[PDB]
Amino acid sequence: AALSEQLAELEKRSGGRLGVAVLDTATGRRFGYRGDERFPMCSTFKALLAAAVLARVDQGKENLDRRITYGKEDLVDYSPVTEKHVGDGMTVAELCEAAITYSDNTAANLLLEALGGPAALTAFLRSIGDNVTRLDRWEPELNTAAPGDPRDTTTPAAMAATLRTLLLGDVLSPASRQQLVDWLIANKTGDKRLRAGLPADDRVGDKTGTGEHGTTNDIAVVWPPNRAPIFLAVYLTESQVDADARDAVIAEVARLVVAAWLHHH
Amino acid sequence: AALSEQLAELEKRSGGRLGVAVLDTATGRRFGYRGDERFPMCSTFKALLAAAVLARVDQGKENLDRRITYGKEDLVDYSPVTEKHVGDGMTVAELCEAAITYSDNTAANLLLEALGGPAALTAFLRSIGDNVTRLDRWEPELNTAAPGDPRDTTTPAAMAATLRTLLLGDVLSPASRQQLVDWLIANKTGDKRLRAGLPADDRVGDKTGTGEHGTTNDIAVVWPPNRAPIFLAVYLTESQVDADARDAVIAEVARLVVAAWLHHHH
Amino acid sequence: AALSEQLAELEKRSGGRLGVAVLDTATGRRFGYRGDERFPMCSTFKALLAAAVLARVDQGKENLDRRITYGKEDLVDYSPVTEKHVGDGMTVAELCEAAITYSDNTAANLLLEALGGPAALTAFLRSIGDNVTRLDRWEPELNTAAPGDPRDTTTPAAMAATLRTLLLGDVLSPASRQQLVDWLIANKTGDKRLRAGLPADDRVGDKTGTGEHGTTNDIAVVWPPNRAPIFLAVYLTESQVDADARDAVIAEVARLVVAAWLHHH
Ligand SMILES: O=[N+]([O-])c1ccc2nn[nH]c2c1
Ligand SMILES: O=[N+]([O-])c1ccc2nn[nH]c2c1
Ligand SMILES: O=[N+]([O-])c1ccc2nn[nH]c2c1
Ligand code: NA
Numbered sequence: 001a002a003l004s005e006q007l008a009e010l011e012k013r014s015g016g017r018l019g020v021a022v023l024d025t026a027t028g029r030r031f032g033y034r035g036d037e038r039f040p041m042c043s044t045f046k047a048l049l050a051a052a053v054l055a056r057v058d059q060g061k062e063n064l065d066r067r068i069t070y071g072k073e074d075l076v077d078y079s080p081v082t083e084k085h086v087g088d089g090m091t092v093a094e095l096c097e098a099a100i101t102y103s104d105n106t107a108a109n110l111l112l113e114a115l116g117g118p119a120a121l122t123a124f125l126r127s128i129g130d131n132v133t134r135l136d137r138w139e140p141e142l143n144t145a146a147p148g149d150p151r152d153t154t155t156p157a158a159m160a161a162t163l164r165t166l167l168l169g170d171v172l173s174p175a176s177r178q179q180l181v182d183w184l185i186a187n188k189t190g191d192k193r194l195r196a197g198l199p200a201d202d203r204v205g206d207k208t209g210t211g212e213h214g215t216t217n218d219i220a221v222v223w224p225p226n227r228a229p230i231f232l233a234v235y236l237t238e239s240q241v242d243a244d245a246r247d248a249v250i251a252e253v254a255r256l257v258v259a260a261w262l263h264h265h
Numbered sequence: 266a267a268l269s270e271q272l273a274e275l276e277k278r279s280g281g282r283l284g285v286a287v288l289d290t291a292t293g294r295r296f297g298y299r300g301d302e303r304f305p306m307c308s309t310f311k312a313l314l315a316a317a318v319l320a321r322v323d324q325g326k327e328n329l330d331r332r333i334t335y336g337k338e339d340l341v342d343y344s345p346v347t348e349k350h351v352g353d354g355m356t357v358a359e360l361c362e363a364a365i366t367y368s369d370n371t372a373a374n375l376l377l378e379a380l381g382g383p384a385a386l387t388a389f390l391r392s393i394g395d396n397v398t399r400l401d402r403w404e405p406e407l408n409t410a411a412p413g414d415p416r417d418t419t420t421p422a423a424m425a426a427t428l429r430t431l432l433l434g435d436v437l438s439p440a441s442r443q444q445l446v447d448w449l450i451a452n453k454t455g456d457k458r459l460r461a462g463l464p465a466d467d468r469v470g471d472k473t474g475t476g477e478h479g480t481t482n483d484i485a486v487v488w489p490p491n492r493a494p495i496f497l498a499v500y501l502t503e504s505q506v507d508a509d510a511r512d513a514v515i516a517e518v519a520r521l522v523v524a525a526w527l528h529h530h531h
Numbered sequence: 532a533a534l535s536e537q538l539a540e541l542e543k544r545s546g547g548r549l550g551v552a553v554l555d556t557a558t559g560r561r562f563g564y565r566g567d568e569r570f571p572m573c574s575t576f577k578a579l580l581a582a583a584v585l586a587r588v589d590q591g592k593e594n595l596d597r598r599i600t601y602g603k604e605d606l607v608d609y610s611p612v613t614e615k616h617v618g619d620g621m622t623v624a625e626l627c628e629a630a631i632t633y634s635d636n637t638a639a640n641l642l643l644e645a646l647g648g649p650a651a652l653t654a655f656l657r658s659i660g661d662n663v664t665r666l667d668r669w670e671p672e673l674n675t676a677a678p679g680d681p682r683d684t685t686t687p688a689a690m691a692a693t694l695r696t697l698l699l700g701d702v703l704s705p706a707s708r709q710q711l712v713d714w715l716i717a718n719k720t721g722d723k724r725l726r727a728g729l730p731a732d733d734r735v736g737d738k739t740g741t742g743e744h745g746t747t748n749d750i751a752v753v754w755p756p757n758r759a760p761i762f763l764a765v766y767l768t769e770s771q772v773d774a775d776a777r778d779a780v781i782a783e784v785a786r787l788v789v790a791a792w793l794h795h796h
Contacts, residue, residue, distance in 0.1 A: 036334045036354075061660050069567050073679040089567075113681070114662045116653040122381040123654075129326045131379045148338040150378065301600045301620070387647040388654075394592045396645045413604040415644065 003260040007033040007253070014249050015240030016214050019233075021156035022257055023164055026228035031260070035157035039235030040145035042209030044159065044219050045121070045135055045152070046099045046108050050183060051166045052115055052124040053096060054176035064093035068110050076139050079106035100183040100207060105139040112138060118152075125162065128171050132158035145211035145237055156233040159219055164231050167221055181205055184221060192247040193218040194232060197254030201225050214239030216246035232257060268525040272298040275521070279514045280505030281479055284498075286421030287522055288429055291493035294529075296522070300422035303397075304500035305410035307474030308368045309424065309484050310386070310400050310417070314376050315361040315448060316431045317389040319441035321380070322357075329358035333375050340371050341404050347371035365448040365472060370404040377403060383417075390427065393436045397423035408476035410502055424484055425498040432486055433494070446470055449486060457512040458483040459497060462519025466490050479504035481511035497522060534791040538564045538784070545780045546771025547745050550764075552687035553788055554695055557759035560795070562788070566688035569663075570766035571676035573740030574634045575690065575750045576652070576666055576683070580642050581627040581714060582697045583655040585707035587646070588623075595624035599641050607670050610637040631714040634739060636670040643669060649683075656693065659702050663689035676742035676768055690750055691764040698752055699760070712736055715752060723778040724749040725763060728785030732756055745770035747777035763788060 011018040011033075019034040056062035069089035075082060081098035082090065083106070090098070095111050098104035115121055118135040125133050135142065136151035143152075154162075165171055167181055184205025193216070195204050206220035215237040222230045234253050239246050276283040276298075286300040321327035334354035340347060346363035347355065348371070355363070360376055363369035380386055383400040390398050400407065401416035408417075419427075430436055432446055449470025458481075460469050467489050474482035480502040487495045499518045504511050542549040542564075550565040587593035600620035606613060612629035613621065614637070621629070626642050629635035646652055649666035656664050666673065667682035674683075685693075698708055715736025724747075726735050733753050740748035746768040753761045765784050770777050 036332075037336075056657075056662075061657065062662055066662065067567075071568075071679070074681070113665065116657045116665065117650060119382065119384055119650055120654065120657065123385065126321075126326065126381045126385065131321075131327055131331065134378060134381065148336075150339070301598075302602075384648070384650055388651065391587075391592065391647045391651065396587075396593055396597070399644060399647065413602070415605070 003031060003256060004033060006256050010249060010252055010256070013241075014236060014246070016236055016238035018249070018253070019156040019235040020253055020257070021160040021231075021233040023160040023231040024228070024261070025164065025168065025230065029264070030157070031257070032157050036155050038150055038153040038155055039217070039237055040143070040211055040215055041133070041135075041152055041154050041159070042143045042145065042211040042215055042217055043103045043105075043108070044154070044207050044209040044217050045142070046103065047163065047180070047184065047207040047219065048125060048133065048135075048166075049108060049111050049115070049121060050096045050100055050180055051172065052121055053092065053111055054172055054180060055124060056115070058173045058176055062092060062114065064091060064096075066092050068092065068095065068114070070106070070110060074106060074109070076105050076109065078140075079104050082106035082110070097183055097186075101186045101188050103189045103208060109139045118142070128162070128165055128169075130158055130162040130165075133162060143211035143215075145213045145215040147213060147238060156235055159233040160231040163219060163221060163233070168229070181221070190218055190220075192244075193250040194220045194234065194254045196247075196251035197258070198222060199224070199258065211237070213237060214241070214246065216243070216250060218250050230261075267528075268296065268521060269298055271521050271525075272518070275514060275517055278506075279501055279511065281501055281503035283514070283518075284421040284500040285518055285522070286425040286496075286498045287526075288425040288496040289493070289526070290429065290433065290495065295422070296525075297422050301420055303415055303418040303420055304482070304502055305408070305474075305476050305478075305480050306398070306400070306417055306419050306424075307408045307410065307476040307480055307482055308370075308373070309419070309472050309474040309482050310398075310407070311364045311368070311373050312428065312445070312449065312472040312484065313390060313398065313431070314373060314380075314386055315365055316437065316445055317380055317386050318357060318361055318376055319437055319445060320389065323438045323441055327357060327379065329356065331357045333357065333360065333379070335371070335375060339374070341374065342370060343405075344369050344371040347375070362448055362451070366451045366453050368454050368473060374404050383407075393427070393430055395423055395427040395430075398427060408480075410476035410478045410480040412478065412503055421498040421500055425496040428484060428486065428498070429496050446486070455483055455485075457509070458515040459485045459487075459499065459519040461512075461516035463487060463523060464489070476502075478502055479506070479511060481508070481515060483515050495526075532562070532791070534562065534787060535564055537787050541780060541783055541787070545767060545777070547767055547769035549780070549784075550687040550766040551784055551788070552691040552762075552764045554691040554762040555792070556695065556699065556761065562791070563688050567686050569681055569684040569686055570748070570768055571674070571740075571742050571746055572664070572666075572683055572685050572690075573674045573676065573742040573746060573748060574639070575685070575738050575740040575748050576664075576673070577630045577634065577639050578694065578711075578715065578738040578750065579656065579664065579697075580639055580646070580652055581631055582703060582711055583646055583652050584623060584627055584642055585703055585711060586655060589704045589707050593623065593645065595622065597623045599623065599626065599645070601637070601641060605637060605640075607636045607640060609671075610635050613637040613641070628714055628717075631738060632717045632719050634720045640670050649673075659693070659696060661689055661693040661696075664693060674742040674746075676744045676746040678744060678769060687764040687766055691762040694750060694752060694764070695762045712752070721749055721751075723775075724781040725751045725765060725785045727778075728782035729753060729789060730755070741774070742768070744768055745772070745777065747774070747781060749781050761792075
């Protein structure tokens with residue numbers, strides 16, 4: 001219980017509530033700190049969104065090259081890619097890439113539309129045995145992160161196990177598994193979070209999330225050199241420290257976890 | 266037509282709108298009084314909620330032993346089992362048992378979340394050919410029972426038929442069928458309603474519902490001695506009599522239906 | 532295209548926004564004018580609603596002869612058939628017939644209940660590869676047609692493609708496709724729109740839509756003599772002319788599309 005104690009101290013310093021799940025596929029060994037408590041997902045849901053879209057592509061019900069057009073009026077805030085393509089539109093794949101690697105919010109709304117809504121995202125998760133995660137609203141309202149509101153939440157343990165199933169299970173075809181991995185590995189938004197505490201020679205894919213009420217999140221798949229991948233889901237909400245210090249909490253969680261795994265071997 | 270006249274009179278004495286459906290599987294014989302009209306389900310939907318969960322267990326997408334945790338602030342009113350387990354949580358199976366046999370409302374929400382919400386329960390019902398019943402809202406709001414509002418409603422006939430399909434058709438595995446039976450037979454909230462009016466030697470499973478606007482419901486599977494099961498769905502809403510008197514209306518429906526089915530055979 | 536320019540002028544006279552898609556199954560030829568912009572469906576979605584009901588009949592999950600009863604409080608405006616059957620109810624088939632050929636609004640709400648609501652119609656569309664069209668609301672609210680609101684919209688191109696798939700593809704059984712076709716051919720509400728501008732010896736089925744903000748729509752399947760069918764989806768919204776002039780805009784679209792198709796040869 002040393003990791004547990006250090007995480008509790010860290011949580012105390014943050015002023016908020018911190019959830020952590022680790023899933024090591026070399027052994028099946030897990031670790032949880034509030035792993036079975038609900039947390040607002042904010043943009044971490046977008047990893048699941050892209051999986052759902054890829055599943056439809058595997059089914060022949062969707063095409064990565066299909067072009068979606070939209071208006072200036074459709075933009076919501078934090079849309080650094082989609083705001084550049086009002087004139088020419090974007091393909092389903094480009095929206096996926098933008099939603100994951102730049103956390104583009106309009107991209108995610110267009111892609112929820114492609115599924116038919118947040119309820120369809122939730123059905124896809126239920127179809128793969130994640131009985132926990134739920135999406136309820138669109139961008140930007142799904143980031144309100146109100147305490148005690150179960151909408152648009154997951155648990156760290158549920159997210160970790162679902163990310164595992166998606167990337168290593170047979171939910172997605174091999175080509176779609178690789179595509180999702182490649183998008184996560186190319187994430188541009190996460191350099192001050194889990195990536196920052198991880199050893200530099202770890203190969204990392206991640207998706208961040210950020211919201212109201214001091215919410216800062218990050219989920220990742222990590223390949224240490226010559227080892228099976230490890231899944232790490234970290235959620236922080238109700239934090240009373242500023243945005244930089246919240247990023248550092250997440251970076252510190254990776255440091256703490258890595259050091260804990262080191263003392264297993 | 267004598268049973269229909271009797272039920273018209275009892276309806277007048279309830280001061281509300283009464284709905285009855287009977288489905289005898291010995292013969293397929295049916296009877297309805299307003300069997301075609303919508304009524305607020307209130308907790309009777311939980312029988313269907315448990316069925317949806319079990320079907321996902323059948324499918325390997327859900328596990329009855331899967332533990333679910335929650336906090337004090339997730340509790341809603343009428344949660345006598347879930348309020349005792351804020352600390353250690355409950356399994357899928359324990360929640361379905363609390364939802365059925367104690368009508369626990371928070372257990373029902375947690376289970377709705379396990380399906381993905383009211384719309385997922387509705388979709389389950391559409392997937393077994395129930396094109397009538399609909400769940401729109403969560404607990405406690407789905408009990409508002411406002412006249413003319415179709416949300417969260419069924420008809421007596423559709424609920425009797427869906428209950429028959431669930432317990433005796435091939436929607437559920439045989440193990441899951443028996444589990445749903447066992448839960449309804451184990452119900453603790455229905456002693457003043459249909460059970461009260463049925464002959465003591467009948468073996469009975471039921472699920473009650475109770476809501477605003479004087480809404481008082483009960484659905485049952487009933488095995489008379491050496492006889493095939495009969496399904497009985499009874500809905501009472503907009504009633505102007507007090508709660509013990511509404512319960513007695515339901516008990517009287519069971520007495521009248523039993524007496525009329527006797528007159529069938531003899 | 533001269534046709535694109537002719538439609539631009541017609542659009543400008545209308546003061547609103549005009550969308551046109553043509554899909555010719557004899558040749559594969561396609562034409563679009565704003566074919567990829569979203570437009571409020573209003574009652575044109577009822578052609579999709581019926582198809583989704585017929586799908587379930589085909590699946591053994593629904594019955595055309597099933598009777599639905601309802602009370603007088605359940606009626607919404609524009610229910611010329613259902614208001615005559617509060618006493619005795621209507622069958623599913625009757626309700627589809629009323630929703631398509633008289634654009635009965637209560638009939639559409641009862642059938643939407645039969646599916647389980649707007650999201651279940653959206654899920655039907657997604658299941659056949661229409662990743663665009665969406666239903667969100669019930670009658671009468673789905674007709675508000677606010678500019679910029681993507682609820683209850685399609686695109687002219689998506690709707691022409693979906694209609695083609697429903698009426699000619701393998702989604703519906705031979706009997707259900709013929710039944711949908713017969714209902715469209717029996718439409719009573721479209722005499723001043725596309726039908727009015729098509730040559731009199733064309734065999735036509737159609738579904739109209741009308742809404743707030745100057746919205747007037749008509750989608751149609753057309754069989755010219757001795758020819759495979761042509762799908763024609765025409766949406767007009769934000770128009771600044773009165774209801775009769777908007778109908779005449781739709782008639783003129785048909786005339787212009789016919790003339791353009793003649794001058795291909
Ligand atoms: O992601 N991780 O939970 C994790 C665990 C152990 C490690 N060792 N090196 N990188 C690691 C990452
Ligand atoms: O549940 N029943 O409607 C029902 C009908 C006839 C009966 N006879 N004995 N028990 C009976 C129950
Ligand atoms: O519906 N049409 O787009 C259409 C196009 C060309 C035609 N020529 N004859 N009828 C026609 C209908
Ligand atoms: Na009526």
